[PDB]
Structure formats: structure tokens, C-alpha cells
Ligand binder design. Structure first.
Ligand SMILES: CN(C)[C@@H]1C(O)=C(C(N)=O)C(=O)[C@@]2(O)C(O)=C3C(=O)c4c(ccc([N+](=O)[O-])c4O)C[C@H]3C[C@@H]12
Ligand SMILES: CN(C)[C@@H]1C(O)=C(C(N)=O)C(=O)[C@@]2(O)C(O)=C3C(=O)c4c(ccc([N+](=O)[O-])c4O)C[C@H]3C[C@@H]12
Ligand SMILES: [Cl-]
Ligand SMILES: [Cl-]
Ligand SMILES: [Cl-]
Ligand SMILES: [Cl-]
Ligand SMILES: [Mg+2]
Ligand SMILES: [Mg+2]
Lengths: 207, 207
């Protein structure tokens, strides 16, 4: 196998789907690429470095609404950007967990700066613009993680009684398991955006 | 060491703080309790069972605003409950990650049902009541996870250039690292609540 950056990442992503984040080891990556371990080490030093790179690559490859379009409202941008962020996390097993704890990479500086400038140009303080951005990110990460892990632990865990469930909770579970969690995510997303709009609009008024 | 349920959990939580979720093994738990492994197995069958129990115990012990007070508004309850949920997750290393993927335990049925009944009594459909509840949970889990993991990976990861940072992003990072992430969480929480209020209020009106 070829051992440049692109090829290693490609093989690491494939491996992530097969084994998940817990079972993604340097050993298994060397076996996957048909090489001895000291050969891999030349290229990739440890698991952390691998994961940091994957976090950046997943967004680079699949997160395609990272910038506002010409004349787009801040409401719209946040919605579209949240939707894009969600898809990209979803495309790989444990994708959301690969993201967790990372900060913007050098490769992402210009992009993330532009998002901050863009909010402030629309009348947000840097601070409220940051909070808006952060709340969308967190809401989105949380939604995705609960479902990615729920579906993962579905193997080991018993399942669910269903018999001695109370009636609202029973119907609640049927509703969350209906779809991705997409509905609940899109509805919760709108609440979040409208609340930022009410905050911005009010200015110094008591609200 | 005594080996009942209470004692095992107590020792498992202590261990979780020392090693985190990744390094919490049955082997190390047997060494911690001064026992051989087949002795532990009698009591605790595997890691998953352990973790499921911890998830439930952390909330039982430290999540103290799980119910509305007499005559409390739905706005207030959601706020207080989110704040309580956050603290409880924060009390242990990887606490939020211990929660992830779990569903309400038998021990939590009555409590979670009451929360659903409570929203519907305030004019939510079961469905919008569920979504409100879920969005708060996800927002809260996401916020906590990003900071718990950020602080964890702070050991392995280089750090941050700081030199070639763009200016808004530079000041953004100084702002998020100012505190827990508490400020950003509490502000994002208010936006979320007000947005649910706008949705509920409007009824069948276009909004
Ligand atoms: C944070 N608040 C909103 C609630 C809560 O306080 C408790 C609790 N035990 O007190 C919880 O169990 C809670 O944190 C929690 O984890 C929940 C769930 O996991 C959950 C609920 C309802 C439905 C699903 N579901 O997936 O279908 C859930 O995963 C109830 C919510 C209620 C959540
Ligand atoms: C989801 N939207 C809102 C943004 C985004 O689309 C990108 C991106 N590269 O396109 C991201 O890098 C993003 O997902 C992301 O992970 C971010 C961060 O990790 C992040 C940001 C600003 C500040 C911090 N911080 O901790 O201080 C962050 O952790 C920018 C946001 C912008 C986030
Ligand atoms: Cl080749
Ligand atoms: Cl090569
Ligand atoms: Cl004893
Ligand atoms: Cl005993
Ligand atoms: Mg991020
Ligand atoms: Mg839960």
C-alpha cells in the first residue's frame, strides 16, 4: 500500500467504520496497510495524532456548508450550517466522538474566523456571536452522540422491558426511535435560532 | 472489602476519577477491592453492566432537581433541571460519557413519566414536550462533553500555536477558556427556553 498522508487517512477512516473509535489501534492500522509497525510509526506517531487528523478530514471532505452564501441571513446560515455539521458527523461510526475535544485546526482558521466576522457584521457582539455558534455546535454534537452511542450499545445491553413501562414514557420511546432523531433535532434547532433572534432584537430593552 | 452493590459502585466511582472511563477495567476494579477476578465476576458481569449502573447512580446521588416544585412554571423547571443535570455530569471524570447512550432505568421510570405529564399539563403535546425535554438534554450533554474531553486531551495534544491565530478566533478562545463554559451554557439555555415559549404561544398561528 502507498503510505502518504492521503492514503493513511483513507485506510484509517475505513478502519473506523469496521471497528469504531475504541478498536482503532496503530497495530490494526499497520496490518490493514500490510506493513510492520515501525514502518507505520515513521508516518503516524500515535493514536491522538491520528484522531486529530481524522477530525479535520471528515469536516473537510463532507461538511460543505461551512460558509454563508451571498446575502444570506444569519438565521439561515446557522440552520444550514447545523444541518451540514450533523451530516458530516453521521457519515462515520463514532464520528461525533472523533470530533469531541478538538479545537479548530490551522487548516480551519480562515473558515472559522469568517463565521465570527459574519455574526458581528449582523449586529452580534463577538461574545453573543460566539455563544450562538457554540450553542448550535453543542446542541448538534449532543444529539448525534446520543444516537450514535445508543445504536452502538444496542449490541451489549439487554434491550428494554416494554411491559412495565409507564404509558407516556412508552410512547415517548416509540417516537424517538421513529427516525434518526432528525425531527427532534430540526425542531429543537428552530427553537434555538428564534431565541437568539429574540435576544438580538431586544437590544437594551428588558426581555 | 465488603462486596455488596453499594460498596462496588462506591469503589467503581472512585476508580473512574483516578483512571477515567477508558481505563476503568474489571481487572483494576478487582485489584482495587483486594479480590481475585472470579470473585468480582460473581458480583459484576462485565464493563457494560458496571457502566449502566454508574450512569444511574450518579444521577440518583447528585441530580437533585429532577421534579418540578409546587406551582413552578415549565420555563423555570427546565432551567433548574438543566442546571442540575449539568452539575451531576460534571461531578465525575468522563461523567457525561458514562451517561451517553443510556435510556431511563426502571429506577427512573416514575420520575421521567412525571416530567412528561408535567409538560403536557402545561399545554404541550406529548410530542413537543418530548422535543423540549430532549433538546435541553442534548444541548446540556454536548456542552459538558466538549469541555470534559477538551480538558482530558489537553495532556496528549501539543497545545495551540497562538501566534498565527486570526484575531477574532484568538479572542474567541480566550473567552471560552475564561470559565467552565458556564456562561455560554446559561446564555444558550435561555435562548432555547424562549424559543419553546414562542412555539407554544403561537398555537396554529403562522410564526
Ligand atoms: C435532564 N432532564 C431533562 C431529564 C432528567 O432530569 C432525568 C432524570 N432522571 O432526572 C433524565 O433521566 C434525563 O437526563 C434523561 O437522560 C432522559 C433520557 O435519557 C430520555 C428521556 C426520554 C426519552 C428518551 N429516549 O431516548 O427516548 C431518553 O433518552 C427522558 C430524559 C429526561 C432527562
Ligand atoms: C458547526 N459550525 C457552527 C462551525 C463549523 O461549521 C466548523 C467548520 N469547520 O466549518 C467548525 O469547526 C465547528 O464545528 C467547530 O467545531 C467549532 C469549534 O470547535 C470552536 C469554534 C470556536 C471556538 C471554540 N472554542 O472552544 O473556543 C471551538 O471549539 C468554532 C466552531 C465552529 C463550528
Ligand atoms: Cl500500492
Ligand atoms: Cl509510500
Ligand atoms: Cl471490609
Ligand atoms: Cl461481601
Ligand atoms: Mg469543534
Ligand atoms: Mg439520558
Amino acid at each position: 500500500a502507498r503510505l502518504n498522508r492521503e492514503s493513511v487517512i483513507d485506510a484509517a477512516l475505513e478502519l473506523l467504520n469496521e471497528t469504531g473509535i475504541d478498536g482503532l489501534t496503530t497495530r490494526k492500522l499497520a496490518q490493514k496497510l500490510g506493513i510492520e509497525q515501525p514502518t507505520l510509526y515513521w508516518h503516524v506517531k500515535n493514536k491522538r495524532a491520528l484522531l486529530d487528523a481524522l477530525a479535520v478530514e471528515i469536516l473537510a471532505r463532507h461538511h460543505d456548508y461551512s460558509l454563508p452564501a451571498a446575502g444570506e441571513s444569519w438565521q439561515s446560515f446557522l440552520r444550514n450550517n447545523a444541518m451540514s455539521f450533523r451530516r458530516a458527523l453521521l457519515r462515520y461510526r463514532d464520528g461525533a466522538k472523533v470530533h469531541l475535544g478538538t479545537r479548530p485546526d490551522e487548516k480551519q482558521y480562515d473558515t472559522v474566523e469568517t463565521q465570527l466576522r459574519f455574526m458581528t457584521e449582523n449586529g452580534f457582539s463577538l461574545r453573543d456571536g460566539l455563544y450562538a455558534i457554540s450553542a448550535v455546535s453543542h446542541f448538534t454534537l449532543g444529539a448525534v452522540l446520543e444516537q450514535q452511542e445508543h445504536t452502538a450499545a444496542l449490541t451489549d445491553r439487554p434491550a428494554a422491558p416494554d411491559e412495565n413501562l409507564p404509558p407516556l414514557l412508552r410512547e415517548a420511546l416509540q417516537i424517538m426511535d421513529s427516525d434518526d432523531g432528525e425531527q427532534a433535532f430540526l425542531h429543537g434547532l428552530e427553537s434555538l435560532i428564534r431565541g437568539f433572534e429574540v435576544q438580538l432584537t431586544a437590544l437594551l430593552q428588558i426581555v
